[PDB]
């Protein structure tokens, strides 16, 4: 299947990992569409509740290996593929169910840009940060614009945004980026934890909160104030609903379904 | 008066607390139409500057009362009676004076809406949070998808939402929920000291403050920065503003009048 | 000098003293068309890649003096050339801006620092936002950006009261970046500001136009840009140096092109 990608299932929880060890898992076009395959495939599939992306070896990663995408970047070509989905998720689309990204070592450029293309971020204690594009001559365009200073506030963001500074797990965690800290190696795990108690709750629930909390961001606050209500209404239509409802009348454990 | 809330009046300040002993200050459809009506009455009644929130006994309140609500949340009527403000304010109408909100205990589901939709969060340090709605088989519908992203972070956030899990006072003060953690027992007495402190400024320009504050939410910054100089010099011509001014000169304390 | 600031040039940084420490740095109508004058100034030139603003003397600023500019509120205050420093009419910079504080940060002073992109302050810094207990309200942008920044409770908590808060709370609602001892803020502020000025200028200029087009616009109109800006930055001299500085391992000199 996948050449630059190491992918795994436990249970309902899919677990990618990163994959070219050798080049500090720099994104070329093969593993950056792969990882679009993988995303887009994850997207469709029903038995998936959650998916957990870190990287292989001694960090998340190093990038983009330019010279690989030159090339594409240049032209303003796609590197998503049919039924692939741009991992980073500014073309438009974002993914429907939850994505955990679990950090390590040096998380530069595109690496913090997918952390917070994320929902939940996790960071064993060797975790440092940079956002080097401007040093480069460029400048970040994977969305941290976009999102790290509604993550962290204008200013946090800046101070790193327009340095190219280094900062640290403590730092990234003070201000909003990182949800916890772990100890060394840790990180994979943790995520994994929280993505299995993700895939307890109930799915229709979990994905109505991603989709209100978007619609939100997207087209307002009244936007998404008009589905609050319409949305509730029909999942108490839900098979889950009376699952859950009664579990909690009856003080025992739901086992959901998705539907 | 109300059956379900116990209200007291402390010179300009509005005091409610929830008050459903037997089923642990849960919401059922009388006290959200009970809440709804204290909070429409608070926004006429001129002689209140600002009102707090609490709930008596053990606990600020355990959310939603399933059904009672359930059925008729299924055939889609308005909990919000004539007179009234919904108060998690998420169908087009906020409040105009300030609230805030004094927790203690467990705050679940449309506890932590509440305190979303306030001004001013205290919780004493036994306070605790669960995000229950996506364990029941639903998902947060009372402005939680909105607000929570925007105070705490999309990823701080998602944590919680996405998981059910409970998370403390320290938590939910880190990621801004919480403005002020005190002792246990201490939070209604901070939230009063507070509110009194806010009934002693300029209630006009109080309520300007919070009117721009919510057009920049609601329309945008130009929306807001196009209102800045006219509201100023509406207040100008207020006699608070002259009150003010010879206040500022003589190094004394203004009693505002709210005109 | 002008008479209300103290300006100058260090190399490609702009270092901006409010002067009128016998008024307590009080925004009079001079000052506030000075410091538009120069930041509308910072804007044009061209040799200028970071601005830091600082106030000289006890405290950074006491706020307004209302008897200076009644008249006007009660008109512009930015002249031909100059640009509104809280950037609230319409207009903002296009290059960064680093705030600088110290002892007492009053009502404006607040609003200035939310309308920069970096805060600096020293462990004596303090904050009023006292408008409210004036029979006003705050006019100068913490009405959007201090709820956008700290959150809407920790925003309010201090701009309904009018309370002081100090550095540390400052810092842990995220108005202040970082906090540095006694009389060490200006030179942090202009630490950063060179580390700056040592990036690519469009690179730094790109940041920040994407990242307003987000909040002004909205997040589809900011990632419509993401690409079609790399593009052009990429035909830049600056990006074929800054390619021949990785691959070369040496670090590059950017001429803003």
Chains 1, 2 share one sequence.
Do not use: C
């Not at 720099?26 to 950056?32: G, I, N, S, V």
């Amino acid at each position: 299947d996948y050449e630059t990608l190491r992918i795994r299932r436990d249970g309902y929880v899919l677990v990618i990992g990163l994959n070219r060890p050798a080049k500090r898992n720099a994104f070329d076009k093969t593993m950056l569409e792969e990882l679009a395959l993988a995303l887009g495939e994850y997207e469709t599939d029903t038995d998936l509740r959650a998916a957990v992306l870190y990287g292989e070896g001694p960090l998340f990663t190093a990038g983009l290996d330019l010279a690989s995408v030159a090339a594409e970047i240049q032209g303003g070509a796609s590197l998503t593929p049919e039924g692939g989905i741009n991992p980073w998720q500014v073309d438009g689309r974002q993914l429907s169910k939850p994505l955990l990204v679990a950090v390590h070592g040096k998380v530069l450029t595109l690496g913090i840009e997918l952390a917070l293309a994320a929902d939940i971020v996790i960071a064993d204690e060797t975790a440092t940060f940079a956002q080097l594009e401007v040093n480069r001559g460029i400048y970040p365009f994977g969305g941290a614009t976009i999102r790290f200073p509604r993550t962290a506030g204008w200013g946090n963001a800046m101070r790193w945004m327009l340095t190219a500074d280094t900062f640290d797990a403590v730092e990234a965690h003070r201000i909003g980026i990182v949800q916890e800290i772990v100890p060394v190696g840790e990180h994979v795990d943790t995520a994994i934890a929280i993505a299995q108690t993700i895939a307890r709750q109930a799915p229709l629930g979990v994905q109505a909160t991603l989709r209100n909390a978007r619609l939100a961001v997207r087209e307002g606050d009244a936007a998404a104030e008009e589905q609050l209500v319409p949305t509730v209404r029909e999942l108490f239509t839900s098979e889950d609903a009376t699952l859950g409802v009664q579990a909690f009348l009856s003080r025992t454990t739901a086992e959901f379904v998705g539907r």
